[PDB]
């Protein structure tokens, strides 16, 4: 309690001093990106899916690496040269019309409510539930209260200290966990025996457990699985998640807002390099501790019997997601476990601050100005604060859906939901950035068709439900058997085809309106038609960043290959 | 042996990057 009290005192003091009293260097930008992405949701989801499935889930985070450099090398020049403050404003400038911008902003807001805020709130809730032994809803209420206090006092230099604290805490935890199990060879030589001894299921619905998925998966060690037989197939990883990460980094407002503040293009590229190098790390720092929790505490983590799972977590399908919280509750020394919770709250606060700022700059700027062209600055700030409060309460209301989905594990739920609605935005952004032929309605109709098909495939997911081997969900295999990342690829391709079909069959857009808004015309010196910056880099720093980017890619590919 | 397959992945990625930069310098 002393460590938590000291950390809270530090936060209150820093916030009070900040309240009383665009040229960011590369390292603060990289720290801001990492803190915006990494939160309690990432730790909980990665640990839970590592306990359930294995290291393959970590390959998701490693695939967030590559796109960042694309974000740093392909779409950042367009964002800076166009002078676009937000992402929907870019499409407002390039395409025109107030229908595409408004709809895309609304869709991004919904992707926020059930991809960023709700998962982080539930992760903080499970942390407090495991540590403080409260109910799930009471834990959500407590997290809401403490996050309101943090926002009122702390609010927004801080990125570097947040990242340093998070990395230090996670490194301490992994150091004390690996020796607890006996090391890397200790974890790899004893993981497959993590099967629980309780397979009874006294309820006559299933009787004896099928003894197929209570044991760890035989291919749990392998990062790459079978294309059809194995869960999270490699076609569903390499191609499936690149499309989603395109929206996450290169197209979402959170990352571009945390990235547009760089001093120059070279500083932005170096910050992206730092973020990728820090993205090498969270595999070791999240997925392996989940296996640690599975090994030391198999009966309390790998439960399959509905009764014991309901006792432990309140859900009969999950309890794989309590891998990380339980781990810090017991493994860490008695004097510790305050610093670990402080680190977790730090990650949650960084993520929520970034999300709130991005949601404010999305709704308060795009929609409100589209509705109220002129308003006072105080009114704008009040609208932003009210939107943050409303977005938080909406995510809290949506949290019960997050409670039990995609087999009871959270990160698979994030990947599934983000594989249904993001690919439309990804296809629209790619077509706008690289295909001049696209028009406003050509992109809009493809986008709305992709949304309709995604919703049609998504409604059964939370209608019929999901379950484990004990009680598989009752839904057609044709509309459920295909992996969510496979459906992401298919929907992305059909949305691209629809957008191209509508565009080539309808009146194009003149080129005079298309200066510096397309990656093929970043360096054009001609004037714009105003349908409604100044990037530069000296060769020495440019080549330095290019070579270190190549080295970072080499390291990422090496770690990809090393874990099969 | 994880290290040998990791080295193979590094080699194939290096060849891929070399080809990409070659076509970049050829097609401008
Ligand atoms: C919420 O963030 C997580 O899921 C997104 C896709 O939604 C991935 O791109 C990212 O690497 C991962 O950390």
């Amino acid at each position: 309690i002393l460590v938590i009290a000291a950390y809270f005192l530090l936060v209150i003091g820093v916030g009070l001093w900040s309240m009383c009293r665009r040229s960011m260097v590369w390292w603060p930008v990289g720290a801001s990106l990492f803190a915006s992405n990494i939160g309690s949701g990432h730790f909980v989801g990665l640990a839970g899916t590592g306990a359930a499935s294995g290291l393959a889930v970590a390959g998701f985070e490693w695939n967030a690496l590559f796109v960042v450099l694309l974000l740093g090398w392909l779409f950042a020049p367009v964002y800076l040269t166009a002078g676009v403050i937000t992402m929907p404003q870019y499409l407002r400038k390039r395409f025109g019309g107030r229908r595409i911008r408004l709809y895309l902003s609304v869709l991004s807001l919904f992707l926020y409510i059930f991809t960023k805020i709700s998962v982080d709130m539930f992760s903080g809730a499970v942390f407090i539930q495991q540590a403080l032994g409260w109910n799930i809803y009471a834990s959500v209420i407590a997290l809401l209260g403490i996050t309101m206090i943090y926002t009122v006092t702390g609010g927004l230099y801080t990125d570097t200290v947040q990242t340093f604290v998070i990395l230090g805490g996670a490194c301490i935890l992994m150091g004390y966990a690996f020796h607890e199990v006996g090391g890397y060879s200790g974890l790899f030589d004893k993981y497959l025996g993590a099967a629980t001894s309780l397979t009874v299921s006294e309820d006559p619905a299933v009787g004896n457990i099928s003894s197929f998925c209570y044991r760890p998966r035989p291919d749990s060690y392998h990062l790459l699985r079978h294309p059809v037989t194995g869960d999270l197939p490699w076609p569903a990883l390499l191609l499936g998640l690149t499309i989603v990460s395109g929206w996450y980094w290169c197209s979402d407002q959170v990352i571009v807002q945390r990235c547009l503040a760089g001093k120059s293009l070279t500083h932005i590229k170096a910050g992206c390099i730092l973020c990728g190098y820090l993205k090498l790390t969270p595999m070791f720092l999240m997925v392996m501790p989940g296996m640690i929790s599975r090994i030391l505490y198999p009966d309390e983590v790998a439960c399959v019997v509905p009764e014991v799972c309901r006792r432990v977590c309140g859900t009969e399908v999950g309890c794989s997601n309590i891998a990380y919280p339980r781990l810090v509750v017991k493994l860490m020394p008695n004097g510790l476990r305050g610093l670990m919770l402080a680190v977790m709250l730090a990650a949650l606060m960084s993520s929520l601050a970034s999300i709130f700022n991005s949601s404010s700059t999305l709704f308060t700027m795009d929609i409100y100005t589209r509705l109220r062209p002129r308003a006072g600055d105080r009114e704008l700030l009040l609208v932003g604060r009210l939107w943050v409060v409303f977005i938080v309460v909406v995510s809290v209301a949506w949290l019960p859906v997050v409670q039990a989905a995609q087999g009871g594990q959270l990160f698979d739920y994030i990947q599934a939901v983000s594989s249904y609605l993001a690919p439309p935005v990804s296809a629209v952004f790619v077509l706008a950035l690289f295909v001049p032929r696209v028009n406003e309605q050509g992109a809009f109709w493809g986008l709305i068709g992709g949304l309709l098909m995604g919703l049609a495939r998504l409604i059964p997911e939370f209608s019929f439900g999901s379950g484990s081997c004990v009680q598989p969900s009752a839904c057609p295999a044709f509309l459920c058997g295909v992996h969510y990342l496979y459906f992401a690829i298919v929907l992305f391709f059909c949305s691209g085809l629809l957008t191209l079909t509508v565009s080539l069959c309808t009146a194009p857009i003149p080129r005079k309106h298309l200066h510096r808004l397309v990656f093929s015309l970043r360096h054009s010196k001609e004037e714009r038609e105003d349908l409604d910056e100044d990037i530069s880099e000296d060769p020495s720093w440019a080549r330095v960043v290019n070579l270190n980017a190549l080295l970072m890619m080499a390291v990422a590919v090496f770690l990809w290959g090393f874990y099969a | 042996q994880p290290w040998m397959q990791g080295l193979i992945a590094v080699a194939v990625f290096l060849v891929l990057v070399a080809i990409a930069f070659a076509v970049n310098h050829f097609w401008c």
Side-chain angles (χ1 to χ4, degrees), chain A residues 76 102 111 117 129 132 146 204 304 319-320 393 403 417 433 466 505 511-512 519 523:
Chain A
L102 168 78
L111 281 193
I117 313 172
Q129 190 252 330
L132 270 170
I146 66 168
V304 288
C319 294
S320 171
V393 65
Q403 183 67 41
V417 165
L433 281 193
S466 179
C505 287
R511 204 201 61 51
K512 64 212 211 193
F519 188 75
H523 302 164

Side-chain angles (χ1 to χ4, degrees), chain A residues 37 42 60-61 64 115 244-245 247-249 411 414-415 418:
Chain A
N37 186 8
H42 284 44
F60 296 172
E61 302 284 3
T115 304
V244 188
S245 287
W247 162 82
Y248 189 97
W249 301 89
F411 198 78
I414 296 170
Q415 298 312 285
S418 283

Side-chain angles (χ1 to χ4, degrees), chain A residues 371-373 375-376 379-382 384 386-394:
Chain A
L371 191 149
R372 171 90 81 169
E379 185 80 344
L380 192 143
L381 190 151
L382 183 63
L386 190 63
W387 179 242
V388 166
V389 176
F390 178 73
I391 200 69
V392 160
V393 65
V394 164

